[PDB]
Amino acid sequence: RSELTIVPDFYPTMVRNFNPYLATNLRTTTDFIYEPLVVFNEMKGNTPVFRLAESYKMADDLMSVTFDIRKGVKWSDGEAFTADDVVYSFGLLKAKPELDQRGINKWVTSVEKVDEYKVRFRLSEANSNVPYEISLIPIVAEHVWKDVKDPTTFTNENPVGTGPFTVIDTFTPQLYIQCRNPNYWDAANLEVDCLRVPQIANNDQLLGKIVNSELDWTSSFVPDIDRTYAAANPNHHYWYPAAGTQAFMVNFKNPDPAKKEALDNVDFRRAFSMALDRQTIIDIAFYGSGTVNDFASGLGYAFEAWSDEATHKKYKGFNTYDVEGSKKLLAKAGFKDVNGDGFVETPSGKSFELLIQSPNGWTDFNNTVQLAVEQLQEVGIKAKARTPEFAVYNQAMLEGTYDVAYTNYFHGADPFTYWNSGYNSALQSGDGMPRFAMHYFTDKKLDGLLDSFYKTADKNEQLAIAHGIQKIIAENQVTIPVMSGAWMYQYNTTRFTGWWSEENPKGRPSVWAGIPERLLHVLDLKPV
Ligand SMILES: CC(=O)N[C@@H]1[C@@H](O)[C@H](O[C@@H]2O[C@H](CO)[C@@H](O[C@@H]3O[C@H](CO)[C@@H](O)[C@H](O)[C@H]3NC(C)=O)[C@H](O)[C@H]2NC(C)=O)[C@@H](CO)O[C@H]1O
């Protein structure tokens, strides 16, 4: 049998959890076990690729959508995939909203079975983007989950799935192997037999394995990639197409009064931003991979057509390396060194040191923070790097105990993915929410604009809304955007061919969970 060795995530040890609704799951659950109704190819104009649904139809008023389910699709246990599974899954997320990690509940009023192969979503608001938003919600088997006592703690260790790889062939603390669904509806197009998923804890362990040609499909940071990895074997390849924003997020609800006095001050956030040398961060921490992001709104240069250039220009100076301007702004805001240590105190005279966190083992981000600490010191801002394990880093954001965090964001075909995930205050509440909105800045007007972005399909209307969003975020310097990154992706031709690449650029090539196109990609791979 052919085994494809993949690394969608690092772990200290393999914990058997295939619940697609829990933040604690394994990152081969979505797509590979639970196939979507539709996969949107974001790189190719956000085009739908129909999988378990064969079609959808939005109502004229954009307030409802029906999906026609493909006939003849089976769960891995042999039972039919039907509208009942879609109705059940959305009903579960309404009953247990802690499982609604994307906040779909607010947008979907009801999900009803029309017949065995047709489901109707009634929406709470007109929403031209709802097919995409629905496409991300995992669909589980009603005939299994109806008998689950507590879906919020169920580890789903024996998953029944619709996707290509549902058989748990091997499971050990150091390795699991996920083999092909024997009843897979699209078996005729699937040539890979199993996913081999070794336990790897961090970038340093990853580097040894990747250089030694032990892996097939990864999306890791690899330092000095041309020298360490690409030159090590003629079969070692990579393709890094452009992706989304990375930024320092500041906690507006910090529990320390001196830190809150700094972090909550827009002039301080701007001075912090002007202390940073974004191009040096890119050159040193990312080995040159990335583009400076000097948009106070975080928009980035790839989305310039969505940008109000007057807004970009008005705030760009606060997002440009400018030590002189940073120091002048600190002084003008009243942040002065009143105790002779070379570090500013708050305007009320309090000392403070900002703890800047990034996830342990994400060495590109760790090195970014170290550079930022040195750059902040030059303007008199005292800071220290912290590298908690991801779960602790994430919990500190969900609990509001962090000071500053370096993070990336997901990245869609338009700016809404970044702006909504990064700023909608509705995404700040929920045990299964991700970290991206957890700065605790809130603005009802901003939320209203985000919630209105797709109320029409009119591009001119969406543009005016985008300009309003850009203005609010920029004028509040909510975060400190640093760069636009890349979809890191490395592939090995030793054991498989058919990979996406710059020469074969079929979609986002990442193996990370949250990139639904990885299902389409795996179906193109052919064993050697
Ligand atoms: C429950 C669930 O599915 N969560 C998904 C997230 O796992 C996923 O976030 C991305 O996760 C990967 C793996 O942890 C991150 O990759 C790491 O990135 C750092 C920083 O560049 C790099 O140093 C590491 O090498 C790299 N690790 C690996 C194993 O490749 C990635 O940065 C995360 N991206 C974001 C925006 O958070 C998200 C995103 O795909 O989807 C969730 O569903």
Ligand SMILES: [Mg+2]
């Ligand atoms: Mg001082």
